[PDB]
Amino acid sequence: AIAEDDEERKILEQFHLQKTEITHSQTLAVLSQKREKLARLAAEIENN
Amino acid sequence: MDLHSLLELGTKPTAPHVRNKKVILFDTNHQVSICNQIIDAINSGIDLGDLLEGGLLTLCVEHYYNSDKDKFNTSPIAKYLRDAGYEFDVIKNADATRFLDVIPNEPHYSPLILALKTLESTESQRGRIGLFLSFCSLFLPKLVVGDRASIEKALRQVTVHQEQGIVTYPNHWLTTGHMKVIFGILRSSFILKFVLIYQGVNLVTGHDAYDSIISNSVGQTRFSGLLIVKTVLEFILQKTDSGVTLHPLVRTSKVKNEVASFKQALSNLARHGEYAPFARVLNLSGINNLEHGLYPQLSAIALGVATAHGSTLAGVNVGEQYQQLREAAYDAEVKLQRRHEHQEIQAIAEDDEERKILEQFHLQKTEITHSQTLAVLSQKREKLARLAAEIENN
Amino acid sequence: MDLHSLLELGTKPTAPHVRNKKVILFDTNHQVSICNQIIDAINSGIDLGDLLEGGLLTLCVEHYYNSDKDKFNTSPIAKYLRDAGYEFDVIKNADATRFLDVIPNEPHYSPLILALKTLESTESQRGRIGLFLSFCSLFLPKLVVGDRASIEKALRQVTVHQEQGIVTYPNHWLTTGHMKVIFGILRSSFILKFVLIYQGVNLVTGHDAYDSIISNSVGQTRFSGLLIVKTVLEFILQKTDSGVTLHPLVRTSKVKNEVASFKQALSNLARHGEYAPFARVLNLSGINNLEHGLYPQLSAIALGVATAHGSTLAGVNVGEQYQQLREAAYDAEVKLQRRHEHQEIQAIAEDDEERKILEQFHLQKTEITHSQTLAVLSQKREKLARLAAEIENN
RNA sequence: UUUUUU
RNA sequence: UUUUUU
RNA sequence: UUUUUU
RNA sequence: UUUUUU
């Protein structure tokens, strides 16, 4: 909807696909450190 | 109700499923040395059977993305391999010298680490990884045929690329046991094939010798096991300015059902997008509905008409139940194309002297084409005789 | 849907990728001495295998941009080489005397520095760097053919340029082992070729002898491996004031598909702009879709018609499957052009005495052309016989 | 009961 | 199952 | 793969 | 590569 040419929509398409891949890799990083934080708290609860 | 919709059930997926595949990306500081030891362990014949996708992805990330892993993680290669089910976990080892130090502590990795203890690696440069991926790209045209055709096309491309002088491969790479090993490596691994197909299409600017070799061999891989698509779309479904028109050999009422089902299973192939040329080599979804046995008469008539235009298509093999209809369609198309070129010569010639010049030229052209077709048929006959001689040798 | 769009997938890149190439620009105060020792290390046969692009770029920046590196950094050479993936880092050494002092401390540079310890360099002037780049420019026409054709055209241009007396090369440069070395240097290095192509096009005013030699040899490099482009655009796709018109030998219904695909792959070549003549020598993008095997009949008919106009094109070699259609198209075009020049002589002559003068002239002109075509065919036949004699010598 | 081919 | 050529 | 001439 | 005469 918001482009004007095919060259403009090629630049905006390449930007928004890279932006979505950035947020998906950040979401997976947050999920992995959440899982390790829960595992470390459970290891401390088992230790204590 | 529409009872002819029963034939289309169970075809297309209604709740699509993917299976997770955990693939191990290695990340050291001595990354070129780790990748050269992965190259040396592949060349030695050592079966690294679960770490094969991880070692090949380490080679491909270190060549194309400079082992950065954040440039790789947001690339469309990694989006495609995530949608195809792979999960990348990057294990890290800041002081790792050898490939022996990097293998995990699973008990089935014990024959791999005792094989890697005695393996001697040669010190080598940055330019061995691109050499190895360029050698693996040569097997990609005629990959889906078999091992003999891949090794023959690979050695022909070794001689073509060394005749330009731009590369040299070592002589133990060109032994047929080693080429058999590299064929099995490329055949059993999905992500090496996809990375070579993607970077052959898309890495186009500022070429190395190796990247031009990979793009040249990926440009010959287009419709590698999809000959029926090229023959039907080029000759049966005729493209003109009015529209699509059928060939006169297929306009009767018994082959029109096969061209309707071919049009449907053809339009489900372009759902794959820009990898729809590469559908049999990557083993994509709709390629079971493009087999020759599903369309026997359409494949034989299309191969006959395509042989009657391009003279080098007489060396394809086909099954025994398709050869004779192929020869009949070839002879009918030779007579039909001769009548058409005679009528067009009568159309475009403005005087009888020019008309005699053009009739002698186009007559001599068809005689040249017919002699080339008999020469390539005799090449096929002693090629199959040499194959059966090798069968009776063992 | 349009099912004939399946044949165009996987062709053009949809997410274009470049690979970074780190190239080392040397910056001392004794820059002419460093560049003359790089020239002497190249001439000695010493393989400086990773510092080759850096040494050649040091030579080219010191010749054309006076080793300024801020005039170079904002030039269109550096914009082009940045878009093609190269990254320049300028290492600095304010008191560096020899090329031995400037090499980094990587461990694979040890055979280079032990080779450079025993290398004797001769003291020489500013005019050796332009002499070396002018000698490297002589291999650029017929670079893409092979080493024998490059060395033969290079020695022919040595004799032409010394017959004007403007240069002299030393006699150990003209030994064929040394010319083989300089061929491999120019073939393996992208940026020396591009710098010579750019400065042959664009450095045009206030000429030295060396810069006129480089511009002369770059003006012969235009369409060096693109003969099919010159033959089709000059003779098949005929230019006139009404438009583009096909030749009468290609207006039938079996070659018009090949001229349509040639028009498409041709218009993707002019996407490269002003280096589209230099597309095979620089190894640019769309040159795999301009091969002779993709268009067999169009290449043979175009080479036949071009041989029938220009008499010196009978010495091109071609494959065995294209020679006979080429000879048929040559004979048809000789008869067609004879009929056209007879009708134009009848058009432009205002009296029969003038018409007899013009008919005798144009008859004698075609007899002269036919004798020259047989002379160059016999030159090709003993040239291939001398080549096969050299094959059986080893 | 089902029956081929791919 | 795939089968040529470049 | 490329193939002449200038 | 250039090729005469003045």
Residue numbers in the entry:
A (entry chain A): 347 to 394
B (entry chain B), C (entry chain B): 1 to 394
Would you copy out the relevant sentences from the publication that reported this structure?
The nucleoprotein (NP) of Marburg virus (MARV), a close relative of Ebola virus (EBOV), encapsidates the single-stranded, negative-sense viral genomic RNA (vRNA) to form the helical NP–RNA complex. The NP–RNA complex constitutes the core structure for the assembly of the nucleocapsid that is responsible for viral RNA synthesis. Similar to EBOV NP, MARV NP possesses the structural domains: an N-terminal arm, an NP core composed of N- and C-terminal lobes, a disordered linker, and a C-terminal tail. The core structure of RNA-free monomeric MARV NP, spanning residues 21–373, features a typical bilobed fold consisting of N-terminal and C-terminal lobes, as determined using X-ray crystallography at 2.9 Å resolution, which is similar to that of the EBOV NP core structure. These two lobes are connected by a flexible hinge region and are considered to clamp the RNA strand between the two lobes by electrostatic interactions.
Here, we show the structure of the MARV NP–RNA complex determined using cryo-electron microscopy at a resolution of 3.1 Å. The constituted complex shows a left-handed double-helical structure, in which respective strands have similar dimensions: each strand contains single-strand RNA, and 30.50 NP subunits per turn and a 128.99 Å helical pitch (rise = 4.23 Å, rotation = 11.8052°) with the outer and inner diameters of ~330 Å and 255 Å, respectively. In the cryo-EM map, the density of the nucleotide bases and most of the side chains are clearly visible, which enabled us to build an atomic model unambiguously showing six RNA nucleotides enclosed by the N- and C-terminal lobes of NP. The respective asymmetric NP subunits, NP-a and NP-b, show very similar conformations as shown by a 0.592 Å backbone Root Mean Square Deviation (RMSD). In the positively charged cleft between the N- and C-terminal lobes, six RNA nucleotides are encapsidated with a “3-bases-inward, 3-bases-outward” configuration. In particular, the interactions between NP and RNA are predominantly electrostatic due to positively charged residues such as K142, K153, R156, and H292 with their side chains pointing to the phosphate backbone of the RNA. The N-terminal arm (residues 1 to 19) protrudes sideway from the N-terminal lobe and has a short 310-helix η1, which is associated with a neighboring NP molecule within the helical complex. Similar to EBOV NP, the N-terminal arm of MARV NPn occupies a hydrophobic pocket located on the C-terminal lobe of NPn+1 via L6 and L9. In our model, helix α15 of NPn is associated with α16 of the adjacent NPn+1, which is mediated by hydrophobic interactions between a hydrophobic patch composed of L249, L325, and L336 on NPn and a hydrophobic region composed of I357, F361, and I368 on NPn+1. The structures of the asymmetric unit, a complex of an NP and six RNA nucleotides, was very similar to that of EBOV, suggesting that both viruses share common mechanisms for the nucleocapsid formation.
